[PDB]
Amino acid sequence: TDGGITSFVRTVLCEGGVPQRPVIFVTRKKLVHAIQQKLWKLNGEPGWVTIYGMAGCGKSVLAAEAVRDHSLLEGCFSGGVHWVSIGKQDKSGLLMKLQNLCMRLDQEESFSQRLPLNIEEAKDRLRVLMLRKHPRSLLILDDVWDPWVLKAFDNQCQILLTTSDKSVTDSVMGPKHVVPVESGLGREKGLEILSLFVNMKKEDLPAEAHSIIKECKGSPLVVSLIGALLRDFPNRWAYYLRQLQNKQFKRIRKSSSYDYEALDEAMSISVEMLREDIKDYYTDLSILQKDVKVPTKVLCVLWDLETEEVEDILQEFVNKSLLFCNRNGKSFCYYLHDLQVDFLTEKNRSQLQDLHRKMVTQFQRYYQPHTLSPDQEDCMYWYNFLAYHMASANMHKELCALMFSLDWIKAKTELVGPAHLIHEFVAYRHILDEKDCAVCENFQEFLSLNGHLLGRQPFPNIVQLGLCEPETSEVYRQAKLQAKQEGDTGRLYLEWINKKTIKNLSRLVVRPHTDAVYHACFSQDGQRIASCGADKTLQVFKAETGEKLLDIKAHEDEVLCCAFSSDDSYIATCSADKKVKIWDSATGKLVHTYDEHSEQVNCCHFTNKSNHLLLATGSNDFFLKLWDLNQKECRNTMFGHTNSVNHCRFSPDDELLASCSADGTLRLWDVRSANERKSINVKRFFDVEVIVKCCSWSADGDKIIVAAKNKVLLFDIHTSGLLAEIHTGHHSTIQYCDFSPYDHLAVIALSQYCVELWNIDSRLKVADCRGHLSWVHGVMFSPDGSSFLTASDDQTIRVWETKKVCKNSAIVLKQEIDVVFQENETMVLAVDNIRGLQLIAGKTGQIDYLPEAQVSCCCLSPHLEYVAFGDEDGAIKIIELPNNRVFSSGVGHKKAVRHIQFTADGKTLISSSEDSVIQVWNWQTGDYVFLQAHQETVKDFRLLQDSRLLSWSFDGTVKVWNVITGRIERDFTCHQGTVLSCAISSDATKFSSTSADKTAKIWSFDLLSPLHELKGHNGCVRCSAFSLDGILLATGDDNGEIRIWNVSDGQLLHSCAPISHGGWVTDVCFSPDSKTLVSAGGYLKWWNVATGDSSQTFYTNGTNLKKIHVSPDFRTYVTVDNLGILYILQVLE
Which residue ranges make up the site for ligand ADP (CB under 6 A)?
Answer: 22, 24-26, 28, 55-61, 143, 193, 220-221, 224, 321, 324, 337
State how far the Cα of 356 lies from the Cα of 394, in Å rounded to an integer: 9
Q: 600 near 555, Cβ under 8 Å?
A: no
What is residue 831's three-state secondary structure?
A: strand
**Nearest approach, Cβ of residue 163 and ligand ADP (Å):** 9
What is residue 73's three-state secondary structure?
A: helix
**Nearest approach, Cβ of residue 105 and ligand ADP (Å):** 24
Q: 820 near 826, Cβ under 8 Å?
A: yes
**Nearest approach, Cβ of residue 190 and ligand ADP (Å):** 10
Q: Which is nearer to ligand ADP, 188 or 865 (CB)?
A: 188
Q: Which stretches does DSSP call E strand in 474-574?
A: 508-510, 521-522, 528-530, 540-542, 548-550, 561-564, 570-574
- Amino acid letter, residue 54: M
- From residue 534, alpha-carbon distances to 25, 684, 734, 799 in Å are 44, 33, 21, 20
State how far the Cα of 197 lies from the Cα of 223, in Å rounded to an integer: 10
What is residue 297's three-state secondary structure?
A: helix
**Nearest approach, Cβ of residue 55 and ligand ADP (Å):** 4
C-alpha dihedral (609, 614, 619, 623), degrees to nearest 10: -110
What is residue 788's three-state secondary structure?
A: strand
**Nearest approach, Cβ of residue 289 and ligand ADP (Å):** 15
Q: Which is nearer to ligand ADP, 335 or 715 (CB)?
A: 335
Q: Which is nearer to ligand ADP, 3 or 1112 (CB)?
A: 3
Alpha helix segments (H runs only) across 273-306: 279-284, 296-303
How many helices (H) does the chain have, and how many strands (E)? 25, 63
What percent of the chain is helix, strand and coil (3-state, nearest 5)? 25, 25, 50
Q: Which is nearer to ligand ADP, 56 or 1081 (CB)?
A: 56
State how far the Cα of 590 lies from the Cα of 581, in Å rounded to an integer: 7
**Nearest approach, Cβ of residue 315 and ligand ADP (Å):** 14
**Nearest approach, Cβ of residue 348 and ligand ADP (Å):** 21
What is residue 32's three-state secondary structure?
A: helix
- Amino acid letter, residue 1019: G
**Nearest approach, Cβ of residue 27 and ligand ADP (Å):** 7
**Nearest approach, Cβ of residue 553 and ligand ADP (Å):** 26
**Nearest approach, Cβ of residue 22 and ligand ADP (Å):** 3
| Strand pairing category for 787-792 and 797-801 | antiparallel
Q: Which stretches does DSSP call E strand in 123-271?
A: 137-144, 158-163, 176-178
**Nearest approach, Cβ of residue 406 and ligand ADP (Å):** 42
| Closest of 297, 403, 392, 321 to residue 353, by C-alpha | 392
| φ and ψ at residue 283, rounded to 5 degrees | -60, -45
**Nearest approach, Cβ of residue 24 and ligand ADP (Å):** 5
**Nearest approach, Cβ of residue 65 and ligand ADP (Å):** 7
- From residue 162, alpha-carbon distances to 99, 217, 700, 756, 867 in Å are 21, 21, 59, 50, 74
Break positions in the chain: residue before each gap, C to N over 2.5 angstroms:
686, 1060
Q: Which is nearer to ligand ADP, 224 or 448 (CB)?
A: 224
Q: Which is nearer to ligand ADP, 193 or 668 (CB)?
A: 193
Give the relative orientation of helices 296-303 and 307-319 as an angle to the nearest 10 degrees: 110
Q: Which is nearer to ligand ADP, 222 or 508 (CB)?
A: 222
**Nearest approach, Cβ of residue 96 and ligand ADP (Å):** 20
| Closest of 94, 155, 595 to residue 384, by C-alpha | 94
Concatenate the DSSP letters of all residues of 479-498 into one string.
Answer: HHHHHHSS-SSS------GG
Q: 769 near 800, Cβ under 8 Å?
A: yes
**Nearest approach, Cβ of residue 398 and ligand ADP (Å):** 35
Sheet containing 570-574: order of strands? 561-564, 570-574, 579-584, 590-595
Q: 757 near 707, Cβ under 8 Å?
A: no
Q: Which is nearer to ligand ADP, 55 or 191 (CB)?
A: 55
